[PDB]
Amino acid sequence: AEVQIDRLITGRLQSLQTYVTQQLIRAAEIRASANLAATKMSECVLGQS
Amino acid sequence: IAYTMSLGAENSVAYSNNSIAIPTNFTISVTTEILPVSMTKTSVDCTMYI
Amino acid sequence: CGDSTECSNLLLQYGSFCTQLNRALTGIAVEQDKNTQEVFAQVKQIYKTPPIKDFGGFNFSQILPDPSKPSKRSFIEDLLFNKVTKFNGLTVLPPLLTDEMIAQYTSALLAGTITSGWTFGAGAALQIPFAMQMAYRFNGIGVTQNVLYENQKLIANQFNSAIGKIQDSLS
Amino acid sequence: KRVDFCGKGYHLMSFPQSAPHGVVFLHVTYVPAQEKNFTTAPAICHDGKAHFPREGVFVSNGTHWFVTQRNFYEPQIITTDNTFVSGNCDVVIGIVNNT
Ligand SMILES: *[C@@H]1O[C@H](CO)[C@@H](O[C@@H]2O[C@H](CO)[C@@H](O)[C@H](O)[C@H]2NC(C)=O)[C@H](O)[C@H]1NC(C)=O
Ligand SMILES: *[C@@H]1O[C@H](CO)[C@@H](O[C@@H]2O[C@H](CO)[C@@H](O)[C@H](O)[C@H]2NC(C)=O)[C@H](O)[C@H]1NC(C)=O
Ligand SMILES: *[C@@H]1O[C@H](CO)[C@@H](O[C@@H]2O[C@H](CO)[C@@H](O)[C@H](O)[C@H]2NC(C)=O)[C@H](O)[C@H]1NC(C)=O
Ligand SMILES: *[C@@H]1O[C@H](CO)[C@@H](O[C@@H]2O[C@H](CO)[C@@H](O)[C@H](O)[C@H]2NC(C)=O)[C@H](O)[C@H]1NC(C)=O
Ligand SMILES: *[C@@H]1O[C@H](CO)[C@@H](O[C@@H]2O[C@H](CO)[C@@H](O)[C@H](O)[C@H]2NC(C)=O)[C@H](O)[C@H]1NC(C)=O
Ligand SMILES: *[C@@H]1O[C@H](CO)[C@@H](O[C@@H]2O[C@H](CO)[C@@H](O)[C@H](O)[C@H]2NC(C)=O)[C@H](O)[C@H]1NC(C)=O
């Protein structure tokens, strides 16, 4: 049982790590887009560019 | 205690079609902002580690 | 593992990967909340448009909030929301700011820019009639303010038609 | 000139300082205060022609009219030197009579 459970454990751990890394990349992209949006809001709504 | 947050003070500016508001004095303000530019440089071996 | 002592005991010897995973996800969530708050929380006060609306012929009805709906959202926002369209150890956390609060920020920004112009972005909001604000804005692009005052009706008509076209295109 | 890029208010200048892994900017800006109301008109009729301000805005304290800047109260008498004329005053909405 330890042998088979270890196989399952390593597989599932690898899958979880892959998911987390993808999430981190996507979050960085979204943050860049939102920074641009904040700049646009400040410069084109509160004034004339 | 717990509550519902307040967005801020609420006011109604007195709009009209023949009235303005012109300042008569001024103030000078100095603010600060902080930005990080670099982090520590690190290196790691293999054989010494694993 | 899913509620199994043997699996958890076996996993206990793999170190502290899961603490790192939880920390990463928590950081992502906090970043999301701070991100939306930073984008939308630009003003300090909640401005309100006057009950009487005579902005030199311009018509902002389709973007001003609608008191009839409980959401207090405008026409375009309602068109937008209607257009965009379970437990194994994963949860979804709610955003810190509800939709009503975001709508309130949007209304405050729009009322402030309609009534005071760009003055409210620096200090205290200063009243000014809309036609004169538009004259300033023309003067800011190299066209003398003379031009606006002889073409007010035509400009208002063009603006209203463009707004109608936008709403039809979205609908 | 871009709004809110460096501090709140109209930007005057900035000064840099160092920090263990970064930089600190001190922004010096300008903020108006102590406003009033006055009354406004878009143009002035005289001899049947319309006058507009070269730079500023028409205000009145209740009895007499003046031209001022847009960011600091400083009334001046209305003169042909600081106004320009364009067409008869029959189309503009909000014109007032003065000299
Ligand atoms: C300018 O005129 C208005 C109108 O008489 C003055 O009154 C203010 O009106 C707004 C909106 O009706 C209220 O919120 C304020 O409380 C009123 N202030 C009063 C009654 O003192 C206003 O005070 C005048 N001055 C300025 C700087 O706006
Ligand atoms: C503009 O504001 C400044 C400061 O807010 C005023 O200067 C103050 O005047 C009072 C009364 O004369 C003094 O007691 C203070 O010490 C002054 N402050 C400083 C820093 O010297 C100034 O009078 C205002 N001007 C106008 C026209 O209102
Ligand atoms: C601004 O535009 C809206 C259109 O969105 C006008 O609302 C119309 O009003 C007339 C008469 O009140 C109605 O017959 C239409 O059915 C309305 N249209 C809609 C889409 O509801 C509104 O009247 C305009 N503003 C002003 C001041 O006239
Ligand atoms: C509006 O401004 C005018 C211009 O200063 C004021 O007229 C002067 O008022 C002073 C103060 O009484 C007199 O000494 C001058 O003789 C006036 N000049 C003229 C040409 O009349 C006027 O009093 C101001 N009105 C208000 C309500 O403040
Ligand atoms: C600003 O709005 C007011 C409010 O309607 C306008 O006042 C009206 O002006 C007309 C023409 O002079 C009169 O027939 C009405 O009786 C006035 N209304 C009231 C309630 O007395 C004023 O004309 C507008 N000023 C502009 C557009 O420059
Ligand atoms: C500004 O002055 C002109 C010139 O006097 C006024 O125009 C006259 O107004 C009276 C009163 O309605 C008429 O009987 C005349 O026929 C007008 N003459 C011309 C040449 O148009 C004008 O009314 C004044 N402005 C205001 C707001 O009273």
Coordinates of C-alpha atoms and ligand atoms in Angstrom, one line a residue:
Chain A
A1 CA 0.0 0.0 0.0
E2 CA 2.8 2.4 0.6
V3 CA 4.2 1.7 -2.8
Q4 CA 1.0 2.3 -4.7
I5 CA 0.0 5.3 -2.5
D6 CA 3.5 6.8 -3.2
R7 CA 2.9 6.5 -6.9
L8 CA -0.4 8.2 -6.7
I9 CA 1.0 10.9 -4.4
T10 CA 3.9 11.8 -6.7
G11 CA 1.5 12.0 -9.7
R12 CA -1.0 14.2 -8.0
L13 CA 1.7 16.5 -6.5
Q14 CA 3.2 17.0 -9.9
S15 CA -0.2 18.0 -11.4
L16 CA -0.8 20.4 -8.5
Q17 CA 2.6 22.1 -9.0
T18 CA 1.9 22.6 -12.7
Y19 CA -1.4 24.2 -12.0
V20 CA 0.1 26.6 -9.5
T21 CA 2.8 27.7 -11.9
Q22 CA 0.3 28.4 -14.7
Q23 CA -1.8 30.4 -12.2
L24 CA 1.2 32.6 -11.3
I25 CA 2.0 33.4 -15.0
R26 CA -1.6 34.3 -15.6
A27 CA -1.7 36.5 -12.5
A28 CA 1.3 38.5 -13.7
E29 CA -0.3 39.1 -17.0
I30 CA -3.5 40.3 -15.4
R31 CA -1.6 42.6 -13.1
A32 CA 0.1 44.2 -16.1
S33 CA -3.2 44.8 -17.8
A34 CA -4.7 46.3 -14.7
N35 CA -1.8 48.7 -14.2
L36 CA -2.4 49.9 -17.8
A37 CA -6.1 50.3 -17.0
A38 CA -5.3 52.4 -13.9
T39 CA -3.0 54.7 -15.9
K40 CA -5.7 55.2 -18.6
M41 CA -8.3 56.0 -15.9
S42 CA -6.0 58.5 -14.3
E43 CA -4.9 60.2 -17.5
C44 CA -7.9 60.2 -19.8
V45 CA -10.8 60.6 -17.3
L46 CA -9.4 63.1 -14.8
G47 CA -7.8 65.2 -17.5
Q48 CA -7.1 65.7 -21.2
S49 CA -4.1 63.9 -22.7
Chain B
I1 CA -17.1 45.0 15.8
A2 CA -18.1 44.3 12.2
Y3 CA -19.9 46.5 9.8
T4 CA -20.3 47.5 6.1
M5 CA -17.5 49.7 4.9
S6 CA -18.2 53.3 3.9
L7 CA -17.0 54.4 0.5
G8 CA -16.5 58.0 1.7
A9 CA -18.0 61.4 2.4
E10 CA -20.9 62.3 0.2
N11 CA -21.4 65.8 -1.1
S12 CA -23.4 67.5 -3.9
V13 CA -21.6 70.3 -5.8
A14 CA -23.9 73.2 -6.6
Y15 CA -24.0 73.0 -10.4
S16 CA -25.7 75.8 -12.3
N17 CA -25.5 77.1 -15.8
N18 CA -24.1 80.6 -14.9
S19 CA -21.8 80.1 -12.0
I20 CA -18.2 79.1 -11.4
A21 CA -15.7 78.7 -8.6
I22 CA -12.3 80.4 -8.7
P23 CA -9.5 79.9 -6.1
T24 CA -8.1 82.8 -4.2
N25 CA -5.1 81.2 -2.5
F26 CA -2.7 78.3 -2.9
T27 CA -0.7 75.8 -0.9
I28 CA 2.5 73.9 -1.7
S29 CA 2.7 70.2 -0.9
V30 CA 5.6 67.7 -0.8
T31 CA 4.7 64.0 -1.0
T32 CA 6.9 60.9 -1.1
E33 CA 6.8 57.7 -3.1
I34 CA 9.1 54.6 -2.9
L35 CA 10.1 52.2 -5.6
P36 CA 12.2 49.0 -5.4
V37 CA 14.8 48.6 -8.2
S38 CA 16.9 45.5 -7.3
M39 CA 17.3 42.4 -5.2
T40 CA 20.1 40.4 -3.8
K41 CA 22.3 38.4 -6.2
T42 CA 22.6 34.7 -5.2
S43 CA 24.2 31.7 -6.7
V44 CA 23.9 28.0 -5.8
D45 CA 26.0 25.0 -6.6
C46 CA 24.8 21.4 -7.2
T47 CA 27.3 18.9 -6.0
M48 CA 27.8 20.8 -2.8
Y49 CA 24.0 20.9 -2.4
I50 CA 22.6 17.5 -3.5
Chain C
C1 CA -5.3 12.3 0.3
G2 CA -8.9 13.1 1.0
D3 CA -9.4 12.1 4.6
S4 CA -7.0 9.2 4.9
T5 CA -4.5 8.9 7.8
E6 CA -2.1 6.7 5.9
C7 CA -1.8 9.0 2.9
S8 CA -1.3 12.1 5.1
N9 CA 1.4 10.2 7.2
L10 CA 3.2 9.2 4.0
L11 CA 3.0 12.7 2.6
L12 CA 4.3 14.1 5.9
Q13 CA 7.9 13.1 4.9
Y14 CA 7.9 15.0 1.6
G15 CA 8.7 18.4 3.3
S16 CA 6.8 21.6 3.0
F17 CA 5.7 21.9 -0.6
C18 CA 2.0 22.5 0.4
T19 CA 2.8 25.5 2.6
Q20 CA 4.5 27.1 -0.4
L21 CA 1.5 26.3 -2.6
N22 CA -1.0 27.8 -0.2
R23 CA 1.2 30.9 0.3
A24 CA 1.4 31.4 -3.5
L25 CA -2.4 31.2 -3.9
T26 CA -3.0 33.5 -1.0
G27 CA -0.7 36.1 -2.5
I28 CA -2.5 35.8 -5.8
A29 CA -5.9 36.5 -4.1
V30 CA -4.6 39.4 -2.1
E31 CA -3.1 40.8 -5.3
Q32 CA -6.4 40.6 -7.1
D33 CA -8.3 42.5 -4.4
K34 CA -5.7 45.2 -4.1
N35 CA -5.6 45.4 -7.9
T36 CA -9.3 46.2 -8.4
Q37 CA -9.3 48.5 -5.4
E38 CA -6.3 50.5 -6.9
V39 CA -8.0 50.7 -10.3
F40 CA -11.3 52.0 -9.1
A41 CA -10.8 53.9 -5.9
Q42 CA -9.5 57.2 -7.4
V43 CA -11.7 59.8 -5.7
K44 CA -12.0 60.7 -2.0
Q45 CA -15.6 61.8 -1.9
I46 CA -18.9 60.6 -3.5
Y47 CA -20.2 63.3 -5.7
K48 CA -23.8 63.5 -6.8
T49 CA -25.4 65.0 -9.9
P50 CA -27.9 67.8 -9.4
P51 CA -31.6 66.8 -9.8
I52 CA -32.1 69.3 -12.6
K53 CA -30.1 68.4 -15.8
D54 CA -29.5 71.1 -18.4
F55 CA -26.0 70.5 -19.7
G56 CA -26.3 72.8 -22.8
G57 CA -28.2 70.3 -24.8
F58 CA -26.0 67.2 -24.1
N59 CA -27.9 64.1 -23.0
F60 CA -26.2 61.7 -20.6
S61 CA -29.3 59.7 -19.6
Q62 CA -28.1 56.4 -20.9
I63 CA -24.9 56.5 -18.8
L64 CA -26.3 58.1 -15.6
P65 CA -27.5 55.7 -12.9
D66 CA -31.1 54.5 -13.0
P67 CA -32.9 54.8 -9.6
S68 CA -35.6 52.4 -10.8
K69 CA -33.4 49.3 -10.8
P70 CA -32.2 48.1 -7.3
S71 CA -28.6 47.8 -8.8
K72 CA -28.6 51.5 -9.4
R73 CA -26.8 50.8 -12.7
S74 CA -27.1 52.6 -16.0
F75 CA -28.4 51.2 -19.3
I76 CA -25.0 50.3 -20.7
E77 CA -23.9 48.5 -17.6
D78 CA -27.0 46.4 -17.6
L79 CA -26.4 45.6 -21.3
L80 CA -22.9 44.6 -20.4
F81 CA -23.7 42.3 -17.5
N82 CA -26.3 40.3 -19.4
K83 CA -23.9 39.7 -22.2
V84 CA -21.0 38.1 -20.4
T85 CA -21.8 34.5 -19.2
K86 CA -18.1 21.1 -7.2
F87 CA -16.3 20.5 -3.9
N88 CA -13.1 18.3 -3.9
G89 CA -10.8 20.4 -1.8
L90 CA -11.2 23.7 -3.8
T91 CA -13.0 26.8 -2.8
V92 CA -13.8 30.2 -4.4
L93 CA -13.5 33.3 -2.3
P94 CA -15.8 36.3 -2.8
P95 CA -14.4 39.6 -3.9
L96 CA -14.0 42.3 -1.3
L97 CA -15.9 44.9 -3.2
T98 CA -19.4 44.1 -4.3
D99 CA -20.9 45.3 -7.6
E100 CA -22.9 48.0 -6.0
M101 CA -19.8 49.6 -4.6
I102 CA -18.0 49.6 -7.9
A103 CA -21.1 51.1 -9.5
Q104 CA -21.0 53.8 -6.9
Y105 CA -17.4 54.7 -7.7
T106 CA -18.3 54.8 -11.4
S107 CA -21.2 57.1 -10.7
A108 CA -19.0 59.3 -8.5
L109 CA -16.3 59.6 -11.2
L110 CA -18.8 60.4 -13.9
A111 CA -20.7 63.0 -11.9
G112 CA -17.5 64.7 -10.9
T113 CA -16.2 64.9 -14.5
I114 CA -19.6 66.2 -15.7
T115 CA -20.0 68.9 -13.1
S116 CA -16.5 70.2 -12.3
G117 CA -14.3 69.2 -15.2
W118 CA -10.7 68.3 -14.4
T119 CA -10.5 70.5 -11.3
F120 CA -11.7 67.8 -9.0
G121 CA -8.8 65.6 -9.9
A122 CA -6.3 67.9 -8.2
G123 CA -8.0 69.6 -5.2
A124 CA -11.6 70.5 -4.4
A125 CA -14.2 70.2 -7.1
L126 CA -15.0 73.6 -8.7
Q127 CA -18.3 74.2 -10.4
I128 CA -18.4 75.3 -14.1
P129 CA -21.1 75.2 -16.8
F130 CA -20.7 72.4 -19.3
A131 CA -20.5 74.5 -22.4
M132 CA -17.6 76.5 -21.1
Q133 CA -15.8 73.3 -20.1
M134 CA -16.2 72.1 -23.7
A135 CA -14.9 75.4 -24.9
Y136 CA -11.8 74.9 -22.8
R137 CA -11.4 71.4 -24.2
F138 CA -11.5 72.7 -27.7
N139 CA -9.0 75.4 -26.8
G140 CA -6.8 72.6 -25.6
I141 CA -6.4 71.0 -29.1
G142 CA -5.6 74.1 -31.1
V143 CA -9.1 75.2 -32.1
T144 CA -10.3 78.6 -30.8
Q145 CA -13.3 78.5 -28.5
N146 CA -15.0 80.8 -31.0
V147 CA -15.9 77.7 -33.0
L148 CA -17.8 75.9 -30.3
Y149 CA -20.3 78.7 -29.5
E150 CA -21.6 78.9 -33.1
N151 CA -22.0 75.1 -33.5
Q152 CA -23.4 74.1 -30.1
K153 CA -26.6 72.5 -31.4
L154 CA -24.9 70.5 -34.1
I155 CA -22.2 69.3 -31.8
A156 CA -24.8 68.2 -29.2
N157 CA -26.8 66.3 -31.9
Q158 CA -23.6 64.5 -33.1
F159 CA -22.8 63.5 -29.6
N160 CA -26.3 62.1 -28.9
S161 CA -26.3 60.2 -32.2
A162 CA -22.9 58.7 -31.4
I163 CA -24.1 57.5 -28.0
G164 CA -27.2 56.0 -29.5
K165 CA -25.1 54.2 -32.1
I166 CA -22.9 52.8 -29.3
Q167 CA -25.8 51.4 -27.4
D168 CA -27.3 49.9 -30.5
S169 CA -24.0 48.3 -31.5
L170 CA -23.7 46.7 -28.0
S171 CA -27.3 45.6 -27.9
Chain D
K1 CA 1.9 67.4 -17.8
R2 CA 0.3 63.9 -17.6
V3 CA -2.1 63.9 -14.6
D4 CA -1.2 62.1 -11.4
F5 CA 2.0 60.6 -12.8
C6 CA 4.0 62.5 -10.1
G7 CA 2.0 63.4 -7.0
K8 CA -1.4 64.9 -6.5
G9 CA -2.1 68.3 -8.0
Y10 CA -0.2 70.2 -10.6
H11 CA 3.4 69.1 -10.8
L12 CA 6.2 71.6 -10.0
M13 CA 9.3 69.5 -9.5
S14 CA 10.9 66.4 -7.9
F15 CA 13.9 65.3 -5.9
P16 CA 15.5 61.8 -5.7
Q17 CA 16.9 60.1 -2.7
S18 CA 18.5 56.6 -2.3
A19 CA 17.2 53.7 -0.3
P20 CA 18.8 50.3 0.4
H21 CA 17.2 48.6 -2.6
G22 CA 15.4 51.4 -4.3
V23 CA 14.6 55.0 -4.8
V24 CA 12.4 57.6 -3.0
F25 CA 10.9 60.6 -4.9
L26 CA 9.9 63.8 -3.2
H27 CA 7.3 65.5 -5.4
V28 CA 6.6 69.2 -5.0
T29 CA 3.3 70.2 -6.3
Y30 CA 0.7 73.1 -6.3
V31 CA -2.8 73.0 -4.8
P32 CA -5.4 75.8 -5.0
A33 CA -7.7 76.7 -2.1
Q34 CA -10.2 79.3 -0.8
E35 CA -12.6 79.5 -3.6
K36 CA -15.7 81.7 -4.2
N37 CA -18.7 81.7 -6.6
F38 CA -19.0 84.8 -8.8
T39 CA -21.2 84.7 -12.0
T40 CA -20.2 83.9 -15.5
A41 CA -21.0 84.7 -19.2
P42 CA -19.6 83.1 -22.4
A43 CA -19.3 86.3 -24.4
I44 CA -20.1 90.0 -24.3
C45 CA -22.1 92.1 -26.8
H46 CA -20.9 95.6 -27.6
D47 CA -21.9 97.7 -30.6
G48 CA -23.6 94.6 -32.0
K49 CA -20.5 92.4 -32.1
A50 CA -19.5 89.6 -29.7
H51 CA -16.2 89.6 -27.7
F52 CA -14.5 86.5 -26.3
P53 CA -11.6 86.5 -23.9
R54 CA -8.1 85.9 -25.3
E55 CA -7.2 84.0 -22.2
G56 CA -9.2 83.9 -19.0
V57 CA -12.8 84.0 -18.1
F58 CA -15.5 86.6 -17.5
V59 CA -16.7 87.1 -13.9
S60 CA -18.8 89.5 -12.0
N61 CA -19.1 90.3 -8.3
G62 CA -22.7 91.4 -8.7
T63 CA -22.4 94.8 -10.3
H64 CA -19.4 95.0 -12.6
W65 CA -17.6 92.5 -14.9
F66 CA -13.9 91.6 -15.1
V67 CA -11.6 89.1 -16.8
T68 CA -9.5 86.8 -14.8
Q69 CA -7.2 83.8 -15.2
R70 CA -8.6 80.3 -14.6
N71 CA -6.5 79.3 -11.6
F72 CA -6.1 82.5 -9.5
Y73 CA -8.5 85.4 -8.8
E74 CA -7.1 88.6 -10.2
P75 CA -9.8 90.9 -11.8
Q76 CA -9.0 93.3 -14.6
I77 CA -11.0 95.8 -16.7
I78 CA -12.3 94.4 -20.0
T79 CA -10.3 96.0 -22.8
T80 CA -9.9 95.4 -26.6
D81 CA -6.3 94.4 -25.7
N82 CA -7.4 91.2 -23.9
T83 CA -10.5 90.3 -25.9
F84 CA -11.1 89.4 -29.5
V85 CA -14.2 89.8 -31.7
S86 CA -15.8 87.3 -34.1
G87 CA -19.2 88.0 -35.7
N88 CA -22.4 89.6 -34.5
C89 CA -23.9 88.4 -31.2
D90 CA -27.1 86.6 -32.3
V91 CA -26.1 83.0 -32.2
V92 CA -24.2 82.5 -28.9
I93 CA -26.4 81.4 -26.0
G94 CA -25.8 83.2 -22.7
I95 CA -24.5 86.5 -24.0
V96 CA -24.8 89.5 -21.7
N97 CA -24.7 93.3 -22.4
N98 CA -21.8 95.4 -21.1
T99 CA -19.2 97.9 -22.3
Ligands
LIG1 C1 -21.8 79.3 -3.6 O1 -23.2 79.4 -3.8 C2 -24.0 78.3 -3.2 C3 -25.4 78.5 -3.5 O2 -26.0 79.6 -2.7 C4 -23.7 78.3 -1.7 O3 -24.5 77.4 -1.0 C5 -24.1 76.0 -1.0 O4 -24.9 75.2 -1.8 C6 -24.5 73.8 -1.8 C7 -25.5 73.1 -2.7 O5 -26.8 73.6 -2.6 C8 -24.6 73.3 -0.3 O6 -24.1 71.9 -0.3 C9 -23.8 74.1 0.6 O7 -23.9 73.7 1.9 C10 -24.2 75.6 0.5 N1 -23.3 76.4 1.4 C11 -23.9 77.3 2.2 C12 -25.3 77.4 2.2 O8 -23.1 78.0 2.9 C13 -22.2 78.1 -1.4 O9 -21.9 78.2 -0.1 C14 -21.4 79.2 -2.2 N2 -20.0 79.0 -2.0 C15 -19.3 78.0 -2.5 C16 -17.8 78.0 -2.2 O10 -19.9 77.1 -3.1
LIG2 C1 -3.1 82.6 1.9 O1 -2.7 81.5 2.8 C2 -1.6 81.9 3.7 C3 -1.4 80.6 4.5 O2 -2.4 79.7 4.4 C4 -2.0 83.1 4.5 O3 -0.9 83.5 5.3 C5 -1.2 83.4 6.7 O4 -1.9 84.6 7.1 C6 -2.3 84.7 8.5 C7 -3.0 86.0 8.7 O5 -2.4 87.0 7.9 C8 -1.0 84.5 9.4 O6 -1.5 84.4 10.7 C9 -0.3 83.2 9.0 O7 0.9 83.1 9.7 C10 0.0 83.2 7.5 N1 0.7 82.0 7.1 C11 2.0 81.9 6.8 C12 2.6 80.6 6.5 O8 2.7 82.9 6.9 C13 -2.4 84.2 3.6 O9 -2.8 85.4 4.3 C14 -3.5 83.8 2.6 N2 -3.8 84.9 1.7 C15 -5.0 85.3 1.3 C16 -5.1 86.4 0.4 O10 -6.0 84.7 1.8
LIG3 C1 -32.1 61.6 -23.6 O1 -32.3 60.5 -24.5 C2 -33.3 59.6 -24.0 C3 -33.2 58.4 -24.9 O2 -32.4 57.3 -24.4 C4 -34.6 60.2 -24.0 O3 -35.6 59.4 -23.5 C5 -36.7 59.3 -24.4 O4 -37.8 60.2 -24.0 C6 -38.9 60.3 -24.8 C7 -39.8 61.3 -24.3 O5 -39.5 61.6 -22.9 C8 -39.5 58.9 -25.0 O6 -40.6 58.9 -25.9 C9 -38.5 57.9 -25.4 O7 -39.1 56.6 -25.4 C10 -37.3 57.9 -24.5 N1 -36.3 57.0 -24.9 C11 -35.9 55.9 -24.2 C12 -34.8 55.0 -24.8 O8 -36.4 55.7 -23.1 C13 -34.6 61.5 -23.1 O9 -35.8 62.2 -23.3 C14 -33.4 62.4 -23.6 N2 -33.3 63.6 -22.7 C15 -34.1 64.6 -22.8 C16 -33.8 65.7 -21.8 O10 -34.9 64.8 -23.7
LIG4 C1 -17.7 94.9 -7.2 O1 -16.5 95.4 -7.6 C2 -16.5 96.8 -7.9 C3 -15.1 97.2 -8.4 O2 -14.2 97.3 -7.3 C4 -16.9 97.6 -6.7 O3 -17.0 99.0 -7.0 C5 -16.1 99.8 -6.2 O4 -16.4 99.6 -4.8 C6 -15.6 100.4 -3.9 C7 -16.0 100.0 -2.5 O5 -17.2 100.7 -2.1 C8 -15.8 101.9 -4.2 O6 -14.8 102.6 -3.4 C9 -15.5 102.2 -5.7 O7 -15.8 103.5 -6.0 C10 -16.3 101.3 -6.6 N1 -16.0 101.5 -8.0 C11 -17.0 101.6 -8.9 C12 -16.5 101.9 -10.3 O8 -18.2 101.6 -8.6 C13 -18.2 97.1 -6.1 O9 -18.5 97.8 -4.9 C14 -18.1 95.6 -5.9 N2 -19.4 95.1 -5.5 C15 -19.6 94.2 -4.5 C16 -21.0 93.8 -4.2 O10 -18.6 93.7 -4.0
LIG5 C1 -29.8 79.0 -17.2 O1 -30.9 78.2 -16.8 C2 -32.0 79.1 -16.4 C3 -33.1 78.2 -15.9 O2 -34.1 77.9 -16.9 C4 -32.5 79.9 -17.6 O3 -33.5 80.8 -17.1 C5 -34.6 81.0 -18.0 O4 -34.3 81.9 -19.0 C6 -35.3 82.1 -20.0 C7 -34.8 83.0 -21.0 O5 -34.0 84.1 -20.5 C8 -36.6 82.6 -19.3 O6 -37.6 82.7 -20.2 C9 -37.0 81.7 -18.1 O7 -38.0 82.3 -17.4 C10 -35.8 81.5 -17.2 N1 -36.1 80.5 -16.1 C11 -36.6 80.9 -14.9 C12 -36.9 79.8 -14.0 O8 -36.7 82.1 -14.6 C13 -31.3 80.7 -18.2 O9 -31.7 81.3 -19.4 C14 -30.2 79.8 -18.5 N2 -29.0 80.5 -18.9 C15 -28.3 80.2 -20.0 C16 -28.7 79.0 -20.7 O10 -27.3 80.9 -20.4
LIG6 C1 -28.6 94.4 -25.2 O1 -28.7 95.6 -25.9 C2 -29.4 95.5 -27.2 C3 -29.4 96.9 -27.9 O2 -30.1 97.8 -27.2 C4 -30.9 95.1 -26.9 O3 -31.6 94.9 -28.1 C5 -32.8 95.6 -28.1 O4 -33.7 95.1 -27.1 C6 -34.9 95.9 -27.0 C7 -35.7 95.2 -25.9 O5 -36.2 94.0 -26.2 C8 -35.7 95.8 -28.3 O6 -36.8 96.6 -28.2 C9 -34.8 96.3 -29.5 O7 -35.4 96.1 -30.7 C10 -33.4 95.6 -29.5 N1 -32.6 96.1 -30.5 C11 -31.8 95.3 -31.3 C12 -31.0 96.0 -32.3 O8 -31.8 94.1 -31.2 C13 -30.9 93.8 -26.1 O9 -32.2 93.5 -25.7 C14 -30.0 93.9 -24.8 N2 -29.9 92.7 -24.1 C15 -30.8 92.4 -23.1 C16 -30.5 91.0 -22.5 O10 -31.6 93.2 -22.7

